[PDB]
Amino acid sequence: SVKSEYAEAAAVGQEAVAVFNTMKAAFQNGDKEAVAQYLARLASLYTRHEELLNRILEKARREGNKEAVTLMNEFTATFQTGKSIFNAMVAAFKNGDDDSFESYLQALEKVTAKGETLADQIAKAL
Numbered sequence: 001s002v003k004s005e006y007a008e009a010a011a012v013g014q015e016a017v018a019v020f021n022t023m024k025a026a027f028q029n030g031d032k033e034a035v036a037q038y039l040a041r042l043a044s045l046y047t048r049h050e051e052l053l054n055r056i057l058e059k060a061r062r063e064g065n066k067e068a069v070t071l072m073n074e075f076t077a078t079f080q081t082g083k084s085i086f087n088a089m090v091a092a093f094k095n096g097d098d099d100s101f102e103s104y105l106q107a108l109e110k111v112t113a114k115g116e117t118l119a120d121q122i123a124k125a126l
């Protein structure tokens, strides 16, 4: 159901957290080769999560689930903010700008955490 599809989306989000934290570690340690591979992994995760999120949103819409639609619209907007910062980070990595990479790493953390207390409102609304 929409709810099993949400637990699958939540698990991909958790896969991103795990990989992001091992990417941050590699960045701090200077292992650019690893960072490069982690950024590719995280790109695919974002893409996969965004597709699971769109299917959940469209499903909630077809189901007339107004509250779920409101919360999903708010969550995906925030999700997109994190994606846009991620893309800026990838660009900082290609350009050799470590000052910006570190900054984006931090802002992407704060934007992802903020979107968490809502993630547990969607779950109960679907």
Ligand SMILES: O=C(O)c1ccc(Cl)cc1
Residues within 6 Å of the ligand: 012, 013, 014, 016, 017, 020, 042, 043, 045, 046, 049, 050, 082, 086, 112
């Ligand atoms: O899909 C997510 O939740 C997600 C994906 C990628 C990053 Cl870097 C951070 C969060």
